[PDB]
Amino acid sequence: AERAALEELVKLQGERVRGLKQQKASAELIEEEVAKLLKLKAQLGPDESKQKFVLKTPKALEEKIRTTETQVLVASAQKKLLEERLKLVSELQDAGIKAELLYKKNPKLLNQLQYCEEAGIPLVAIIGEQELKDGVIKLRSVTSREEVDVRREDLVEEIKRRTGQPLSIS
């Protein structure tokens, strides 16, 4: 445990700094521990209110996502915290088709290319909040065509339609 260890470091840090500050003084040791304690407490968790919408929680069937027979792959460009890629991939992967993510072993366009070519050999999707607004989302059909123009809605629809079939009642 990383946080657990540090959490214990803080507890003992506060008891030592305070206990020594009073009975053995030493503003040098006192100041050194207090500072180290301040960052320590802020390291493990400055405030719980920080979190929002609550954290993950189990339900019943399965306790995590799945990815193996992914027929499509929806990623985005432009460097970032993978926030946009996780948002779209979540909707696509979770609500529609099950997609994977790749971005290792590749020179230029390592992310978009490595994933689409290696991971998304069948169907691919190059979305992007920035593109969706000023441009739009793209559905790379390396297999059938190469690149398509969709606005997220068509991305999940097209990929799902190509993988599935119309009409459910017979």
CA dist list (Å): 20 to 5, 17, 31, 35, 38? 22, 5, 11, 15, 17
Q: Which of 56, 75, 99 is the C-terminal boundary of a domain?
A: 56
SS3 per residue for the chain:
CHHHHHHHHHHHHHHHHHHHHHHCCCHHHHHHHHHHHHHHHHHHCCCCCCCCCCCCCCCCCCCCCCCCCCCEEEEECCCCCCHHHHHHHHHHHHHCCCECCCCCCCCCCHHHHHHHHHHCCCEEEEECHHHHHHCCEECCCCCCCCCCEECCHHHHHHHHHHHCCCCCCC
The contacts of residue 71 (CB under 8 Å, 6+ apart) are: 97, 98, 122, 123, 159, 163
> Does the CA dihedral 76-80-86-87 come out positive or negative?
negative
Of the candidates 117, 114, 89, which has an alpha carbon nearest to the alpha carbon of residue 104? 114
Question: Do residues 63 and 136 share a domain?
Answer: yes
The C-alpha atoms of residue 68 and residue 142 are separated, in whole angstroms, by 19
Question: Do residues 1 and 31 share a domain?
Answer: yes
Residue 41 is part of a domain; what is its CATH number?
1.10.287.10
Token pair, residue 92, equals: 């696509």
Question: Do residues 69 and 47 share a domain?
Answer: no
Q: Which of 14, 41, 56 is the C-terminal boundary of a domain?
A: 56
Token pair, residue 61, equals: 């069937």
> Does the CA dihedral 155-157-159-162 come out positive or negative?
negative
The C-alpha atoms of residue 140 and residue 73 are separated, in whole angstroms, by 9
Phi, psi (rounded to 5 degrees) for 150: -135, 155
CA dist list (Å): 138 to 28, 32, 100? 60, 54, 17
Token pair, residue 57, equals: 């929680």
**Amino acid (one-letter) located at 147:** E
List the Cα angle 63/69/72 in 5-degree steps.
105
Question: Do residues 169 and 93 share a domain?
Answer: yes
The C-alpha atoms of residue 101 and residue 118 are separated, in whole angstroms, by 10
The C-alpha atoms of residue 71 and residue 60 are separated, in whole angstroms, by 26
81 is in which domain, residue-wise? 57-170
The C-alpha atoms of residue 45 and residue 2 are separated, in whole angstroms, by 12
Question: Do residues 90 and 164 share a domain?
Answer: yes
Question: Do residues 157 and 102 share a domain?
Answer: yes
60, exposed or middle or buried, with CB in 10 Å at 0-12, 13-18, 19+?
exposed
Helix axes 2-23, 27-44, angle to 10 degrees: 150
Q: How many separate domains does the chain show? A: 2
Question: Do residues 140 and 107 share a domain?
Answer: yes
